[model samples]
Target: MPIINKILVIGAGIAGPAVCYWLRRFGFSPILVERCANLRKGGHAVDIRGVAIDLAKSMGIYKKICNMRTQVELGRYVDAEGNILHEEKDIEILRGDLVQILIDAMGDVPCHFNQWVESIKQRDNDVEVQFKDGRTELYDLVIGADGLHSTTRRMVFDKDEYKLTNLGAYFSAFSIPNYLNLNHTDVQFEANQKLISMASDKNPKIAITGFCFRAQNVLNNLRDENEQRRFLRDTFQDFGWETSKILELMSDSNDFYFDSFTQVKMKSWTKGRVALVGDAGYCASPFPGQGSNQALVGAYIFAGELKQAEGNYHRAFNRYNELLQPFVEANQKFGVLVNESFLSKEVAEERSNKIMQEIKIVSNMISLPNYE
Candidate 1:
């Protein structure tokens, strides 16, 4: 018999639906909630790799994910003048594409959209949760799969308990009409001051633009949309190539996303019946490009550990922490290295080889348990 069967999972992103799928597979009941009214769509591409590839195969969704992968058939590294310096083959998929696949795999798991937790109180054996809609419920377990700025983490952990490390950079991405007529290709231009990346998908009509740069001083209105647009414009104004043209279409995009390149570092991911997964717990700042990978693997292990402990959550949570921490540490280190190295005007072939090697090692760092 399982220790507790009722599980409440927060966030509908990569982690929440993933855990819900596993918990249900393990014969547990899980209820999922998302603060947004609908699943968020549009963002940079996400990669599936290493043990995560194994996990996806096990879940029977690897082929589907690959089928829905991004159409960037060619990737290029270019100079500020748009001269191709290097070229490579790559596999990339839109963030929304993967999320939709996970959601589809979750089947009929009860999901409440436009709902959020207003407060949580831990009782002796169960946790009482009040929703923002004034609804209340009790559950045996609460998983915060919410992203970087997780409400569950803020409510449960004290200010001093967790840390956000700003990687001395900010990143923004948005979609625009493929006016450049890029076909199944991605182009990246980098300088000491800023970096710009653009790609067009199989859709042929839409393309994506990404910007990353080091920001020494923090902006006063970082969260203000207009301020963020202005910041992007100001930072890339002096750059050459298609940058000026891209910024011209920035305001016209409906899916503009901008945020500081930051990572969440917590000594622990669990408190009582509540625990965090994915960016809610440890975000590697997208520098290592493993946020989704970590969430997929983390959700699997978290639920697998619970099954191994046969519902002894204390044991499961402990093993979850022990087995996952080392992997998190290694990836965070990789993220730091990328943050420090990638902002330069040139990426040495030697440096690139070294980083790829480290990424391989860190990505398969954990040995996964066979949950079946």
Candidate 2:
């Protein structure tokens, strides 16, 4: 019988690579795979506030993150006419940058880009993973850390075993030229339950535009990229405030990401020889700035507990399910609350204060369990 040492980790995003580092420290050999051709470069900035900060600090990458953080000097809130109403400051690193930092920090674990598990069969003592390229391999354990629309979750979890709770909204982001010539500044236009925000920094030649809007329904297949883009075009085509021009550029934007405000809730993140981690199991969903942190926190707990259990995943997986659920639920609730009154035409002062307060609280909500 093979020991639970050779591990298969699906997804090269934050969670998968995050878990691999600790897995290596804990005496397991983990192989990371990503379906994408390469590490994605299109995601928006993500907050690494509170406890997540400590994790990154321990990894010795927090300084680098701060050095490369997104610098929004003035968050210029405007109206439908695009007139400045107010301003504020934001803190975080680009999601793309953080992934690269983590990838850089991943010292020697095998990471295969343009690779993914086509199917996973859970055997009595191991998992047989067949890649999309017709390669088969066996591992003592499998961890599904793929985010949001995780293919790993689909292969092992039945529809009833998980959820895709749409939070009555759609969110997306893409890169474009700094046509407005924004310099370390972000201009926002919010009204009629819609938001169009754009910002530029570091690279004066490029910028990113983010969209958040209310929607009662989605397309026939949530997985269809074309339909998703069409939905965006149809939703914002009539809106004013440079929307028409942005939509035109969106059509040609290659570095883009689209997703609905959906949360994945699961009772148990493990089945047979397979286990789930980070967003693949519990995603509080978009825009709280805490989503990335949850992946790190889950990675910390999942790997540490595996060490504590000495490869007997029966104990480690159970501890992961029990220990991480509350944290996941709290962040998920924070995610919901943030979106509850998110699209107000005007930014409410006290409401924003409350959200900021909650961001800190939930970010540090769970005390890291000691492994020693």
Candidate 3:
């Protein structure tokens, strides 16, 4: 019998690398594989605070995140004429930059990019992972750090499927040129049940645009990029406020991300030595402001539990699932509530402001474990 010295992590995004960092710090070996050939460098803005702040503080990545943070000058609310209405300041970032921060911190950790998980098998003691290229590897543990449509979740978890609560909204993210001369700021346009936001990030040379709407029907083929572009173009054909120009840039913008803003609800996060983490386990979904935060917290606690249990996979997994369940529920509900509030042309900035003012109440809505 081989010792449980080697571990395989199935995705090298936020959760995957963060977990690998902790595992290595605590004296373990982990190999990370990513579906993309390189680090994925696109997605909408994500904010980090609270427990996420604490975790990053411990890792000393907070200052770097702040330094490389997407410095949005202002958030301008405009009508169809591109006329500015309401505006705010300082609270947004691109998802890719943060991911870069996590990866940069991880250094060289045996990452195999452009690889996908074909199937996974967990037996009496180890896990057998099959790859898209017909390669096979056996390891002591297999971690499903992959995102929402996790194949690892499908391959090993059969007890139940994750409950996806569609909050009656769909969102898409893409990049475009800085035609607005936006100047480190963002302009949000709203009309006729369509919401479009354009913002400049660290890469001042360009800007990002995100489209969101209330779609009753689930997307027919979510993974088809062509279909995603068509859906956006069809839905927002008549949407004004520089919409045409943004649409023109759509075809060239390759990193288009479209999905029904849904939350993942799972009963438990572990199956034998194979366990799920990040969006793979309990994705708070796109609308959830604290998605990145949860990933940070999950990484720390998961590794901490594993170390505490002295590599007893079952015990560590149970404690991780139990301790994080309440927190996950609170954050997922937050995502649903945020998604629901977007049912109209005008965003409830005031309501959001009021909620943020009482962020202590919202963030502490659930109890977190200190993990002694």
Candidate 4:
């Protein structure tokens, strides 16, 4: 409402810093904030494929991402007796590496780490934001670039009427020493309601392990780290061959990441000048393999619209949502489809076969519209 020179962006993940960069390029002063004291890192892998790959190249960071790409060349599916059921040759990269590349590209933007937005109050032209500390700031707009579990979305927009559906699955991932001597390859074991995968990559001396489970009900206190660890151990304690050893290392894992593989289906991502971006608005969930892609495309289109609209914040936000919704919907459903296919009673050989077939449909799946 008040001539919007000052912009506030919440979260320092891929989307927040990215939006800050574009906003500044378009002549708006934006301040970025994160709850984490430093850059938020962890997790196994996230794809940068599709139109998102094109967006990163346009931003001049695709080469950096390629350099930081994980040097994993093989993916193997094994059985309980250490028998190789299947294997595929491809590259698997690390999530933290990509985040680092994003940080390097975002030069000199004002970032407030170890901070978060406490609440937001929107008036006719400006949004007033209160920080965790006793500080308040007014901005022409507040962008919630935070991830799936967005506090900003809950605080400012109407609570999502849809439940956070877990899609009958759970997953945990972390980094570890290459104890199994895996080399440029991945080892996987899949059985009733569970899966374990480990891969050796650019970080040759280390391996990353991913654990997945399918369940009908929720795990109580899912946010408690200790409870989550105990739950993982209880679920996989009796599974054979490196399963026990992997869980043992999880306790000390610095990059431990665990969450239910759930989808966020919100009715809307914006209310007035305050809007949601990236995972906060629509997380098709991790299994979809399109989270990073969605975020990258969202940032590009959002910033591009703001510039094109000449700071008509409402128009920019409108075009951002309308154009991006179709792409997001397709990818989110793509994730759901993957989980459904995996959880089915497929014959061992058919599991990977199904994924390979479906991937062709999911990759290169969306059309880009002109926001400029």
Compare the candidates by TM-score and give the number of the best one.
Answer: 2
Q: Could you give the C-alpha RMSD of every candidate to the true structure, in order shown? A: 2.3, 2.0, 2.7, 2.7
User: What tens digits encode model 2's per-residue C-alpha lDDT throughout 130-200?
Assistant: 98789999999999998888888899999999988888888889998889999899898887889888889
lDDT of the candidates, in the order given: 0.86, 0.84, 0.77, 0.77
For model 1, residues 1-372, the per-residue Cα lDDT tens digits are: 447899999999899989988888887899999988888776898888789888898889889888888756798898877788999882357888888888889977998899979998888889999987798999998999998888999988899889999888889989999998989989889887688999887578989899988888765677678989988898888798899989999879988888887889988899888989899999989888888888999999999998878868988898888889988888898888887776633557678778878887678777998878
lDDT of 1: 0.86
Tens digit of lDDT per residue, candidate 4, span 167-251? Answer: 7778888888989888888898887878998888777788889999876665467777788888888889788767988888887
Per-model TM against the reference? 0.92, 0.94, 0.92, 0.90
Off by over 4 Å in 4: 90-92, 160-163, 344-372
* Cα RMSD, model 1: 2.3
Estimate the overall C-alpha local distance difference test score of candidate 4: 0.77
The TM-score that candidate 2 achieves is 0.94
Any residue pairs clashing in model 4, and if so which?
1-125, 2-125, 71-202
Instruction: Output the lDDT of residue 316, model 2.
Output: 89
Give the lDDT of residue 105 in candidate 1.
91
Q: Pick the candidate with the highest lDDT.
A: 1
Tens digits of per-residue lDDT for model 3, 192-247: 77799888756677888988888876556667778878888888997898889999
Q: How would the candidate models be sorted by TM-score, starting from the highest?
A: 2, 1, 3, 4
